[PDB]
Write a protein that binds this ligand. Sequence first.
Ligand SMILES: [Cl-]
Ligand SMILES: [Cl-]
Ligand SMILES: [Cl-]
Ligand SMILES: [Cl-]
Ligand SMILES: [Cl-]
Ligand SMILES: [Cl-]
Ligand SMILES: [Fe+3]
Ligand SMILES: [Fe+3]
Ligand SMILES: [Fe+3]
Ligand SMILES: [Fe+3]
Ligand SMILES: [Fe+3]
Ligand SMILES: [Fe+3]
Ligand SMILES: [Fe+3]
Ligand SMILES: [Fe+3]
Ligand SMILES: [Fe+3]
Ligand SMILES: [Fe+3]
Ligand SMILES: [Fe+3]
Ligand SMILES: [Fe+3]
Ligand SMILES: [Fe+3]
Ligand SMILES: [Fe+3]
Ligand SMILES: [Fe+3]
Ligand SMILES: [Fe+3]
Ligand SMILES: [Fe+3]
Ligand SMILES: [Fe+3]
Ligand SMILES: [Fe+3]
Ligand SMILES: [Fe+3]
Ligand SMILES: [Fe+3]
Ligand SMILES: [Fe+3]
Ligand SMILES: [Fe+3]
Ligand SMILES: [Fe+3]
Ligand SMILES: [Fe+3]
Ligand SMILES: [Fe+3]
Ligand SMILES: [Fe+3]
Ligand SMILES: [Fe+3]
Ligand SMILES: [Fe+3]
Ligand SMILES: [Fe+3]
Ligand SMILES: [Fe+3]
Ligand SMILES: [Fe+3]
Ligand SMILES: [Fe+3]
Ligand SMILES: [Fe+3]
Ligand SMILES: [Fe+3]
Ligand SMILES: [Fe+3]
Ligand SMILES: [Fe+3]
Ligand SMILES: [Fe+3]
Ligand SMILES: [Fe+3]
Ligand SMILES: [Fe+3]
Ligand SMILES: [Fe+3]
Ligand SMILES: [Fe+3]
Ligand SMILES: [Fe+3]
Ligand SMILES: [Fe+3]
Ligand SMILES: [Fe+3]
Ligand SMILES: [Fe+3]
Ligand SMILES: [Fe+3]
Ligand SMILES: [Fe+3]
Ligand SMILES: [Fe+3]
Ligand SMILES: [Fe+3]
Ligand SMILES: [Fe+3]
Ligand SMILES: [Fe+3]
Ligand SMILES: [Fe+3]
Ligand SMILES: [Fe+3]
Ligand SMILES: [Fe+3]
Ligand SMILES: [Fe+3]
Ligand SMILES: [Fe+3]
Ligand SMILES: [Fe+3]
Ligand SMILES: [Fe+3]
Ligand SMILES: [Fe+3]
Ligand SMILES: [Fe+3]
Ligand SMILES: [Fe+3]
Ligand SMILES: [Fe+3]
Ligand SMILES: [Fe+3]
Ligand SMILES: [Fe+3]
Ligand SMILES: [Fe+3]
Ligand SMILES: [Fe+3]
Ligand SMILES: [Fe+3]
Ligand SMILES: [Fe+3]
Ligand SMILES: [Mg+2]
Ligand SMILES: [Mg+2]
Ligand SMILES: [Mg+2]
Ligand SMILES: [Mg+2]
Ligand SMILES: [Mg+2]
Ligand SMILES: [Mg+2]
Ligand SMILES: [Mg+2]
Ligand SMILES: [Mg+2]
Ligand SMILES: [Mg+2]
Ligand SMILES: [Mg+2]
Ligand SMILES: [Mg+2]
Ligand SMILES: [Mg+2]
Lengths: 173, 173, 173, 173, 173, 173
Amino acid sequence: IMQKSNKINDALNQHYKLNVELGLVYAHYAHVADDEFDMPYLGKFIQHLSEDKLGVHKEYISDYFKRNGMKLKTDVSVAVKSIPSDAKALIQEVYARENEVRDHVKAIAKLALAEDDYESFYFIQWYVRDGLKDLTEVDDVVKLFNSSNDKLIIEETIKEMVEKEESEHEIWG
Amino acid sequence: IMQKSNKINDALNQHYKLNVELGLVYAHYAHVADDEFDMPYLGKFIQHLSEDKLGVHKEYISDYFKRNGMKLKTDVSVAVKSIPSDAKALIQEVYARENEVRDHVKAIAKLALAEDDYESFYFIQWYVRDGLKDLTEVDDVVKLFNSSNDKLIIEETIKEMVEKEESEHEIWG
Amino acid sequence: IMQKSNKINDALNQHYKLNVELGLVYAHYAHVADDEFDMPYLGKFIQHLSEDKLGVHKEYISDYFKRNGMKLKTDVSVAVKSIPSDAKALIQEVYARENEVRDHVKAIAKLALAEDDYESFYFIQWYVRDGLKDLTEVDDVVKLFNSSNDKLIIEETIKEMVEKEESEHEIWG
Amino acid sequence: IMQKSNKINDALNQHYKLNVELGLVYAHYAHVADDEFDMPYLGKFIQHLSEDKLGVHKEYISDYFKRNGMKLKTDVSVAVKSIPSDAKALIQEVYARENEVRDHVKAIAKLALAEDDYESFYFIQWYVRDGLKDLTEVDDVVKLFNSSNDKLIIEETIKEMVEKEESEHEIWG
Amino acid sequence: IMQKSNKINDALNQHYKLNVELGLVYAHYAHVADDEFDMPYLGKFIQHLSEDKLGVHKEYISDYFKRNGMKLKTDVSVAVKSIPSDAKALIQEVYARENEVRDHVKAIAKLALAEDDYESFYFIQWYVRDGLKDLTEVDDVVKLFNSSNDKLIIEETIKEMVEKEESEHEIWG
Amino acid sequence: IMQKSNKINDALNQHYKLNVELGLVYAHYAHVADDEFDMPYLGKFIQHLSEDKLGVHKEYISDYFKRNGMKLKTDVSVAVKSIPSDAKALIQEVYARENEVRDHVKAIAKLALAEDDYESFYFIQWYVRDGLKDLTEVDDVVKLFNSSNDKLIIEETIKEMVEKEESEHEIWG
Ligand SMILES: [Cl-]
Ligand SMILES: [Cl-]
Ligand SMILES: [Cl-]
Ligand SMILES: [Cl-]
Ligand SMILES: [Cl-]
Ligand SMILES: [Cl-]
Ligand SMILES: [Fe+3]
Ligand SMILES: [Fe+3]
Ligand SMILES: [Fe+3]
Ligand SMILES: [Fe+3]
Ligand SMILES: [Fe+3]
Ligand SMILES: [Fe+3]
Ligand SMILES: [Fe+3]
Ligand SMILES: [Fe+3]
Ligand SMILES: [Fe+3]
Ligand SMILES: [Fe+3]
Ligand SMILES: [Fe+3]
Ligand SMILES: [Fe+3]
Ligand SMILES: [Fe+3]
Ligand SMILES: [Fe+3]
Ligand SMILES: [Fe+3]
Ligand SMILES: [Fe+3]
Ligand SMILES: [Fe+3]
Ligand SMILES: [Fe+3]
Ligand SMILES: [Fe+3]
Ligand SMILES: [Fe+3]
Ligand SMILES: [Fe+3]
Ligand SMILES: [Fe+3]
Ligand SMILES: [Fe+3]
Ligand SMILES: [Fe+3]
Ligand SMILES: [Fe+3]
Ligand SMILES: [Fe+3]
Ligand SMILES: [Fe+3]
Ligand SMILES: [Fe+3]
Ligand SMILES: [Fe+3]
Ligand SMILES: [Fe+3]
Ligand SMILES: [Fe+3]
Ligand SMILES: [Fe+3]
Ligand SMILES: [Fe+3]
Ligand SMILES: [Fe+3]
Ligand SMILES: [Fe+3]
Ligand SMILES: [Fe+3]
Ligand SMILES: [Fe+3]
Ligand SMILES: [Fe+3]
Ligand SMILES: [Fe+3]
Ligand SMILES: [Fe+3]
Ligand SMILES: [Fe+3]
Ligand SMILES: [Fe+3]
Ligand SMILES: [Fe+3]
Ligand SMILES: [Fe+3]
Ligand SMILES: [Fe+3]
Ligand SMILES: [Fe+3]
Ligand SMILES: [Fe+3]
Ligand SMILES: [Fe+3]
Ligand SMILES: [Fe+3]
Ligand SMILES: [Fe+3]
Ligand SMILES: [Fe+3]
Ligand SMILES: [Fe+3]
Ligand SMILES: [Fe+3]
Ligand SMILES: [Fe+3]
Ligand SMILES: [Fe+3]
Ligand SMILES: [Fe+3]
Ligand SMILES: [Fe+3]
Ligand SMILES: [Fe+3]
Ligand SMILES: [Fe+3]
Ligand SMILES: [Fe+3]
Ligand SMILES: [Fe+3]
Ligand SMILES: [Fe+3]
Ligand SMILES: [Fe+3]
Ligand SMILES: [Fe+3]
Ligand SMILES: [Fe+3]
Ligand SMILES: [Fe+3]
Ligand SMILES: [Fe+3]
Ligand SMILES: [Fe+3]
Ligand SMILES: [Fe+3]
Ligand SMILES: [Mg+2]
Ligand SMILES: [Mg+2]
Ligand SMILES: [Mg+2]
Ligand SMILES: [Mg+2]
Ligand SMILES: [Mg+2]
Ligand SMILES: [Mg+2]
Ligand SMILES: [Mg+2]
Ligand SMILES: [Mg+2]
Ligand SMILES: [Mg+2]
Ligand SMILES: [Mg+2]
Ligand SMILES: [Mg+2]
Ligand SMILES: [Mg+2]
């Protein structure tokens, strides 16, 4: 009874890998944001995101696996070989990656229902919610580049964003 | 004047890579320590170490690069394909890896002097000190497996270790 | 035994002189930043730097000399005969001078090792670290002029910089 | 209307120069007081005076210039080529220099009235008062050398002087 | 890999021995300072120094050895067979011994670099700094005997020295 | 009148020597307890004892000598050439040495009465009491090795012992 789904096990190992590799890319993008583009607050924003991916996003999968018999796999391959040309494009790339996260998560949820794995459907709810939350935070920064042509003005707004004491939306938080 | 050393740049990119990959391996080893070996406090110890490697150890390199013109490279390849057979061997493997850290760091320091890069010699001092500190903490756990054959007794001692409020040795801390 | 190095004595007298003269130039540049360029916060930044050079940078040399038998020399000659054309160039000049500081300090460290003067190598470590720290702070201001064409926006960012309660980086601080 | 006095501008540039050079000499004399004469508290007294000259004494001139259109000049030439033979003579030399300060200040005040520059006459009042205050503090130390032949007794009295929480005389303070 | 240097092991065993024997001599000198020379505060100064040598100076070596595989040796031979004739000479002897400490430490640092032992070079930095700090504190007392011929006046100054709440110099502290 | 006993003077010089040499041996044994036997809490126990011997045990003799005219002698010879084979034997050796302390102290007390030296009989009372107290504390550790074969269990008990806030027995404390 209660035999773990091998299909969910694979999908969640692939999502663990995605969050590790994303976090490593974001750490690089945070360096570049500060170093090459002269936007240290944009750097801090991306760095916070790197740490989210390499922290809780991966941790919760490992924890879940310990509880249900699923096997963890660690297989990572990532290389930053090209960087976006400017800051606007850097954050737009981050946006595209977060949009893909939402698509991957949707798939896992759909799979959990197909496999009648209600514990996994429950688990993924955090990721479903976070898919949108994280995208929204990134979108809030993307908007800035369309609203001013002054990098320092944009930076002042990012500063408040990163320095605000984090509030949780009742639903998406 | 003050042109960055390409040799130091490469050695520090390789050490960034080493700390990323080590941290990912340790995250896996922390999972296994808890999940397979029934030693959650040993897991927490290795997890703290994973976070050290993927946190400050890498961050300080990126920060340094921003200050001196050195280029960051992100190129990561890691796969955990075999795990040690028991807990004793798991921590002994961690020990071996920390010993290798000390050897890599020694090389960077020697190189900094050869290149007359005193800013880099200063920078690496943190890593020289930490090489030993981290090894010592790991050694403290290795010792336990040679001092008791009861996994729960060992776990009780690791618990105090991980839960003690961190003290800094005047020299190695 | 323990006879002071005459070569280190000379190099450190020359560095005392450099820090005095730099501080006097920076005091003038701080006046001009406010008075001629309408950037009082940029003025305060350069003034803080003037006081750093004429304070601790020189004080620590005098203190060291008292401890080891080295002789202090006071020989100062400085005249500000031309000023940079605008604020961007003013801070870029400050940058160039800080870069030269790093080069002079490198030389002292190299000399200390050649003379087997380990007390002097220890002493200069503060200056090695500070060379980079001070350059970084100046670079943070230079960046601003490349990130906005509005002097008041730049000034608002410098204001936060000068008014932030000073934090020390674990390594460079 | 309200065109700045070129004569006052020159006199105040010369007084800026005097305060810079005095402060650099006093910094040397403070070193010697401690290092050569074995009187660290006498050193601290002279050092406090060095910092007064290189601090507020010069700062107030720069500030004034910013307000009225006067031009700041930085032209400094100072070399300590001979030092007084003992501590008594060191402080007596400091006294002579402070007496000369009072004479220079008198001249500026007289000039301000001749030029009908009431803003400058107001400004110099601080310096008129301080001329005497600073001389008095130096005289208080000179007296000590005429009142004891024991350097440590003198040092104990200087210690209280430098360590007393500064009080301001209603008139001269 | 990371095999301990036998040469550094010997040099540090010899420095452990030096600090033990120095501390025992200083304990005797502290007794004599009080008992024979009627200078209890001078006694307390030397006693504090005895405890420094027999405390942290030796402890840090033992700690280091535990971390790196080096072997501790305990081999002590000390006899106080002659004492200096008066207090001035007692502290001058302490001074000579501290000067020799600095010379021994210099040698260890030089050796660490020759052996490419960067962990040992890091370790010895504490001792390099302390060599000078301790000498300075002793010099501060030596000076007193050249500044007064009254033993009680000297004692009053030593009292403040030993009773001041210890401050750390940014570099030498 | 009140001429010091030369016999008591010698016995107390020999006891000063014994406490110095014991303390140096115990410092070595504390190192070995931690380093070789993997028992850091046992190390801390022996280290506390080293510091007791080299602290108050010797200090009180020096103090007494200052008060009564007795002469202090410093003559120390100690070499740790063999170490006990295991931890049990290490603490048993410490026990044997403490038992010998009690025997030496008994002799001094007996001598004080024979010499009608009541001040010395009073003085030695501290040492008579401490002979037993210190032996008892050591016995409490010896017992542990006879009560468990698990080094970590023993270590947990030693930890409480060394970390308990010290209580004084009404008689032996
Ligand atoms: Cl199923
Ligand atoms: Cl080079
Ligand atoms: Cl030399
Ligand atoms: Cl006019
Ligand atoms: Cl070697
Ligand atoms: Cl008798
Ligand atoms: Fe995925
Ligand atoms: Fe930054
Ligand atoms: Fe967040
Ligand atoms: Fe979790
Ligand atoms: Fe598992
Ligand atoms: Fe590739
Ligand atoms: Fe790429
Ligand atoms: Fe850009
Ligand atoms: Fe674009
Ligand atoms: Fe499906
Ligand atoms: Fe998230
Ligand atoms: Fe604004
Ligand atoms: Fe490496
Ligand atoms: Fe658990
Ligand atoms: Fe840690
Ligand atoms: Fe950092
Ligand atoms: Fe970069
Ligand atoms: Fe593979
Ligand atoms: Fe593997
Ligand atoms: Fe196991
Ligand atoms: Fe095994
Ligand atoms: Fe090399
Ligand atoms: Fe670490
Ligand atoms: Fe220089
Ligand atoms: Fe202003
Ligand atoms: Fe600063
Ligand atoms: Fe200083
Ligand atoms: Fe000097
Ligand atoms: Fe000129
Ligand atoms: Fe010029
Ligand atoms: Fe401008
Ligand atoms: Fe321009
Ligand atoms: Fe050189
Ligand atoms: Fe600085
Ligand atoms: Fe003047
Ligand atoms: Fe001093
Ligand atoms: Fe004042
Ligand atoms: Fe002002
Ligand atoms: Fe002006
Ligand atoms: Fe000249
Ligand atoms: Fe002169
Ligand atoms: Fe004198
Ligand atoms: Fe004279
Ligand atoms: Fe006039
Ligand atoms: Fe003044
Ligand atoms: Fe007095
Ligand atoms: Fe030595
Ligand atoms: Fe006394
Ligand atoms: Fe001290
Ligand atoms: Fe220690
Ligand atoms: Fe050892
Ligand atoms: Fe002998
Ligand atoms: Fe002797
Ligand atoms: Fe005397
Ligand atoms: Fe004499
Ligand atoms: Fe050598
Ligand atoms: Fe010391
Ligand atoms: Fe005895
Ligand atoms: Fe330990
Ligand atoms: Fe005790
Ligand atoms: Fe006492
Ligand atoms: Fe005596
Ligand atoms: Fe022997
Ligand atoms: Fe032996
Ligand atoms: Fe054992
Ligand atoms: Fe046995
Ligand atoms: Fe008897
Ligand atoms: Fe005791
Ligand atoms: Fe227990
Ligand atoms: Mg499968
Ligand atoms: Mg269905
Ligand atoms: Mg290359
Ligand atoms: Mg070379
Ligand atoms: Mg010369
Ligand atoms: Mg050499
Ligand atoms: Mg003119
Ligand atoms: Mg008139
Ligand atoms: Mg050998
Ligand atoms: Mg070499
Ligand atoms: Mg006799
Ligand atoms: Mg009788």
